[model samples]
Target chain A: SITSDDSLEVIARKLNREKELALEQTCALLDYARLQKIIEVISKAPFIQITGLGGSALVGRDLSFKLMKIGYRVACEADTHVQATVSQALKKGDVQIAISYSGSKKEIVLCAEAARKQGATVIAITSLTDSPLRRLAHFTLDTVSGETEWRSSSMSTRTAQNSVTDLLFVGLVQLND
Target chain B: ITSDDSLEVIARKLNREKELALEQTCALLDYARLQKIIEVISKAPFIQITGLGGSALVGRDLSFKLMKIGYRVACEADTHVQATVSQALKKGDVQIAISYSGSKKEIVLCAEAARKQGATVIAITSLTDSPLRRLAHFTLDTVSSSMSTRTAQNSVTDLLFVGLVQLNDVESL
Candidate 1:
């Protein structure tokens, strides 16, 4: 736990440490080979569906913007009916990527399972936990664990997720070129 | 203007730039002020963030991140909103003003007004001695030499975000 009473130097050092650790965790767990293959799979698809819950959803939206800007048929939905939206958009030969930290969110897991049943190639970006979503994914890119904060909002998790999102975005753009 | 380079080049550059931005921003930040800024913001009832253009985008991102983590946050994207928000801030509230150039007119004025209201004003800018910096009670500096100052601004904010998380997490424990 962090406190305001800590020295300024101490706070700055801890902050930098968290940032460094989060990035390092992502760099270590990300499977570049799997990512490249996923990029190839996504490139050939006519439609790409991106969804996540809470902070992960924000990441889905960010990636959606980049994909849309590049003229891809992409739907980034993270609202109340995300499971239905993702399930409805998914079809055989489509690519559906779900971002979740815990990998246990009911909606995200349901969406992944639905996409799998539809024959859509499912990709999951989540933590190392042996989550049910991981078993349903055709490809999985795991992120390192972020330090726990009680009532912790998704700080480290989001950072690691964004790293992968940015990576995939760049990978897809390169394939296009 | 930013260009669309090959994925390989972009990937390499993005990773490099992220590392570089983190190093430079951390090096430039004054730890004492950073600590004070964290303390002040933690004690405040609410926070108002203001910026323009790319900085405004960063402002919006910060507001979202903070709100998600249980912080009461607001952001002003345009001059009108900045003025109205600044005037409405009460003492014990906090204002975080951002400007890469360290001299955006609206940002400076907003910081000044917030300070006048006796709210703690924090500035995230590139220059050490600009008007916004002058008006701010605490300042954190970010390097602006990159192709996009947005990268550096994000780094600075990430520091703040992670820092606050650490502080709050500890206190909760």
Candidate 2:
């Protein structure tokens, strides 16, 4: 097992090392062109809706609070009625930011797809290379946290995603000013 | 008009200091103390996590991970609620308090209360000699840096969770 032998330090080092690598990879994978487009959409949108499930749900809440604190009309819905809430709030020119580490959660995908069909722009933040959510996204910001079975709550992925969202929030603040 | 003008600077510092802090923190940590904390927490009936501001975010993050793995965990940041929880903790429970400053008023008070109640308190902070550290039964310290302490704080929590997971497996086997 991965007991607390002399290896605890090594394991902690590896975890931090992986986090650094993932952040670097995400920076390289980011599409500035698409990011500018998103900035434009968000600036003009009536409101922004962030939705996810499980660990991603917590991420959505965190981002929602941050964006709201900066005076954006942001709603974070990750409850039992998230899908229904997004369906009703979404409209043309609105923005939908969906987070899922795997990019394969059926509920998140369906919510994103429905928002897309309703004319809202869908932004997918996930690490998975190929998934239905990625395929349907108008813009995709890849958070490249390589997954493992032991990463039950996907802490690394969540951190990477949070970093990306922090960048987006900064960009939005600049544009708004 | 805060802009991306400083984004590169912030990102660079975070990327650089994150690795450095982890290495330094690992060197500074006492594995025996870490092992003892893990053993106490693993057998505890439940865990109560307390912090404030950014540290509260770390507490929330840890609470999420522990609950996902089916551990009983509660994270409280409100002063009144934290005090009540601290007062209610019994022997054989774990109280995890996070504060980068190592001297948050509420966190120090809560940890002291928990200790008096016979609960095992694990203090995660950046300073070795501080009020919280002095009160905790076990202390896991991280290297202080000008860059955000969140990353280092988070890495420390990740290590503890991983250790607890390993200990759980050993118990089952």
Candidate 3:
């Protein structure tokens, strides 16, 4: 059973292994040519919006800040109404980075649908091989998720997405200047 | 670098991510503070976490789950919101300020605001001698470079969440 006594080394080790495994899986799952394509698209887009509910939002939020710091106009919002307004307002030149680890969150799926309907490119971040999120978006950056360890934990799922963020952030930076 | 090799550095670093986390986790200056952090956070009536940019994600992730587990946790990326919320904190409240450099001015002010209100300020920083660390009642260090700062923060905070869940069983605190 999981207990306070077991947290220090035990949980730390578990988080490490799962996070590492997820990153390795993400590395294997990604397609480099598609990543380059996504990078070019994001680089050209004048405005970008990211939306998700929980951990997926956490992943996109971090990426939004990272991209913004590097002079990309990026924002990630959590409010459903705000997401709806932003997605509907987006035009052809804009981009929406919709993140959902499992590709099942309705809020994100709806946002992706709305943004794509408005002619914006919807790049999804999810782990599903074929999911609602993937079907709705033009491109999907697949992450890895084990879904549970010791208990219900997004440790690996979040890590996988985070590593993808890191890769995308680095790739975008590498293409700069 | 072509697109194929564009992500090589990221992969190399990520391959090393777990190792950095492991090293940082196993090498805490004192395990006692780790225990105390979880214990204090469990009893705190309110917890305010503040950080900037990437560091802010650490607060958000921790705050997100802490609230789900029934703790009154507040964290936001905006510096102004962070200031006002930190000001509302009173004694026995906890504010966790995270910074990779430990010198971010806004985060330092976040700690300063909470510390002035007599709240316990805990810093998750990479620097031992940073202003943020100086203001904190307790400090947990992570690796100081790259994405590892947040990665290690993630590592330790996840551990804190797990430990908090375990301790929630006591029902006496």
Candidate 4:
């Protein structure tokens, strides 16, 4: 079962095939027109509060800290209390960004609704354009990453989502000027 | 079609949300302010990284990366050692604090020791307003909304540690 050439060549070929598809799909999403709207919304906000569930939440946290080091007032909520802190914020020019894979998770939906109620613009970054979470927001940045990966590594979809988050964060950082 | 548990689980988790973990780690370097933090880190001679538990593992990874880039480095898992290292800090030393909770007890001590010695303190944590944040000259705050779960904590540590590592610019350091 263990052969010298068998260690990497076969796996490498399969991964290369999957990598190509991932690139094609990721490029398609980058060119989507709706991302422009999200960029416009982020361009207007001073502090960006990000919210999400599970892995999406991790992405939000990572983005929040990076923005913080840049001297922006950024917060990501891991608990309902933190979420409430941002949602109830009466500060002007606050933007709430919620990330959900399904775009329909109940907790995130509630947080999005609350953020909207507080007069904060909301950006729902997700794979679903028409999910309830998206419908509740002021803008949508849809990443073409689905829940599964073609090569079984989940590398493609995650790469796409990560790529989109970077685009948004970089756009926002640039907007500071 | 061979099935190994570790391989199979990894296959499943990869299909799950682990891809996002990699995303959070990479996005930080693109931030401008964090770029400033990296600039400061590059100027230092000895860089000490400290954290607890899983966060400590991340500290180890960062130390490894920094060495690969040819900096004199040490990783600390013990709070006492961290404080001792910080206490010895002089003009050219840099202390990096890696904690998921910025207010953790040992982390607070490490930051305090570094601050007392006039060494530069940089804290990478999820809580920007935590007491540790106040003590640091630089802060890289991560925001994990799902820190309530076990998997989330692991992801946050991996992302934050790796994120900062990627932020290191060899020419700048």
Q: Give the per-residue lDDT digits (tens) of candidate 2, residues B1-173.
A: 22446555545545566667766777787777788888888888989999887677678888888897798988975778888999899988989999987787899999989988889988898765899988988888877532337667877888888877877876787
Misplaced by over 4 Å in model 3 are A1-5, A147-152, B1-5, B17-22, B170-173
Question: Fraction of reference contacts reproduced per prediction?
Answer: 0.17, 0.32, 0.57, 0.00
Docking class of 3: medium
Each prediction's Cα RMSD?
A: 4.5, 3.1, 2.9, 16.3
Shift in Å, residue B156, candidate 2: 1.1
TM-score of each: 0.76, 0.87, 0.88, 0.47
**Chain B TM-score against the true chain B, candidate 2:** 0.89
lDDT by residue for model 4 over B58-124, one digit each (tens)? 5664565467658787777666776788778776688888776788898898788887877788877
Q: How do the residues B32-132 of candidate 3 rate in per-residue lDDT, one tens digit apiece?
A: 77888888988899999888877787788888888887899899877798899999889999998878788888998878989899999888877568898
Second chain TM-score for model 1: 0.86
Any runs in candidate 4 off by more than 4 Å, and if so which?
A1-20, A31-34, A90-92, A146-155, B1-173
* Candidate with better TM-score, 2 vs 4: 2
Which run of 10 residues does model 2 chain A get worst, by summed lDDT? A146-155
Q: Indicate the docking level reached by candidate 1.
A: acceptable
**Candidate 2's error at A104, in angstroms?**
1.3
- Scored against the true structure, residue B143 in model 3 reaches a CA lDDT of 67
Residues A1-177 of candidate 4 have per-residue lDDT tens digits of: 112222122332333234334434554544435665677767667778888754456567666766676777778877877776667773556788887767777888887787778778888777745888888877776666422231222333434455556556555554544
Which residue runs does candidate 2 get wrong by more than 4 Å? A1-6, A151-153, B1-14, B77-79, B144-147
The model with the greatest DockQ is 3
Order of models, best lDDT first: 3, 2, 1, 4
lDDT (C-alpha) at residue B80 in model 3: 95
The docking quality of candidate 4, as DockQ, is 0.03
